[PDB]
Design a protein around this ligand. Structure first.
Ligand code: HEM
Ligand code: HEM
Lengths: 249, 249
């Protein structure tokens, strides 16, 4: 149900050139997970009923950066600012979603389709829309389903984003990577989730909540068994996430 | 542009009986200003663009009561609870707006028309929509105009609500009454505003902002000169305020 806006040939050229620059920068700086988090925290605030929040560049606002969920994202914003300044024609909205897409690609994940044209909006959403790591399945459906408008399948596939990166006791309070290979986009998140606790690896209560749900569980199993199927469903869910409220939501 | 809902004859009877009980209670307890504040803080959170907030009973929620603007309104809620329990058929939305209307009447103000039928909504608006006492005319238009959808005239007339009651250093930090007669609804707020500072009387920066604005000032002058005109415009503005998002906003 999307109708994507026309952007100029110059705009498209800058997308292509920014995409390449983002690859080099993110790979060199080893900051793919942080950039994926930046894109997800930008998009994940969308509320379908009121058409507020979502991926519209507001994550750069000091006010949204002050949200406790967004601990450490000021680093992400700061890291990208010099690069963004090379592409003044692009919206921050687009640039940050493009960073997220590139973060997934340079760690070896699926190629998430990208459509330009998000406008930078003046008002950040209110604080408190991002999911709570201590809650379970009901909460996840409230946030991803009732607010964002994504599916149960999208919830499980997107949770797989934890295949890269780590928690930090100074940010959330949780600590350590979900996987043994936290700069590699693979289905290891689901394998580790299933096998139970292992020394040095993290599971949030929100990850554990996927195991006990009658709908989430079969998807955890599917993705653990079949990384191709994970990649397919992940690319679908990330695209929808990155486009919430955009070109029709 | 309002279309008021049908309510049962039993509902209407309870409105009439609650109105009378509210008169006696508010007069005896000397709590008209607090009740007017309770009604205004309930209604004043309406945002026209998203149709969120407004007079829908959510002021009783511990979460909205925790808003710093709402210091001392937990007392107001507590005071009315026994009375409300005598009228289980009425929405809190209606009961609190009716308290506001009665607060104005029992202190000798205009008779603000009242239409029943507000539904109690599950979600409080986000914090931060109520006006800031330290700001001026631009802010007042942002809040009353851009968010609530009221007029410049409504801003000045409603500011006249400060004709009753007082600030408290333990609540806002401001202190004392606007008028020499703070349980009497009259045009004294505008008279005192115009004559400048007087010992024992309060003026907020937001009240003072009415004096310097080219549109607000002539209305301050009109109301100071003519309490009948104040009463007419006040009754209009309060009615619109009490009905924001209700029966069409
Ligand atoms: C399902 C609900 C989710 C919860 C409760 C949640 C919660 C968290 C928490 C608590 C952290 C640790 C932050 C820190 O301490 O540094 C984190 C990190 C992370 N999240 Fe999630 N998140 C969720 C969904 C997602 C989604 C949908 C994605 C992307 C598709 C994602 C991607 C990431 C990444 C890449 C990191 C690592 C950041 C880094 O390495 O600095 N998360 N998340
Ligand atoms: C114009 C912007 C407004 C600002 C900045 C503002 C601000 C304030 C502040 C700071 C207080 C003192 C709270 C305390 O310390 O106890 C107060 C009290 C009060 N306000 Fe306003 N207010 C505004 C508009 C209104 C409106 C529209 C009404 C109703 C029509 C209203 C009715 C009242 C009443 C009756 C009190 C006294 C409460 C008491 O006696 O405990 N105000 N307001």
């Amino acid at each position: 149900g999307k109708s994507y806006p026309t952007v100029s040939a110059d705009y498209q050229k800058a997308v292509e050139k920014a995409k390449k620059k983002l690859r080099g920068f993110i790979a060199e700086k080893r900051c793919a997970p942080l950039m994926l988090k930046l894109a997800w925290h930008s998009a994940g605030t969308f509320d379908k009923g009121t058409k507020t929040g979502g991926p519209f560049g507001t994550i750069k606002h000091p006010a949204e950066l002050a949200h406790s969920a967004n601990n450490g994202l000021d680093i992400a914003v700061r890291l990208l600012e010099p690069l963004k300044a090379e592409f003044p024609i692009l919206s921050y909205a687009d640039f940050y979603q493009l960073a997220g897409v590139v973060a997934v690609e340079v760690t070896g994940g699926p190629e998430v389709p990208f459509h330009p044209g998000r406008e930078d909006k003046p008002e950040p959403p209110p604080e408190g829309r991002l999911p709570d790591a201590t809650k379970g399945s009901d909460h996840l459906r409230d946030v991803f389903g009732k607010a964002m408008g994504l599916t149960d399948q999208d919830i499980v596939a997107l949770s797989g984003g934890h295949t890269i990166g780590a928690a930090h006791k100074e940010r959330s309070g949780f600590e350590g990577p979900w996987t043994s290979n936290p700069l590699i986009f693979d289905n290891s998140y689901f394998t580790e989730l299933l096998s139970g606790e292992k020394e040095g690896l993290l599971q949030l209560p929100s990850d554990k909540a996927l195991l006990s749900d009658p709908v989430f569980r079969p998807l955890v199993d599917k993705y653990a068994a079949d990384e191709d199927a994970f990649f397919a469903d992940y690319a679908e869910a990330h695209q929808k996430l990155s486009e919430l409220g955009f070109a029709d939501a």
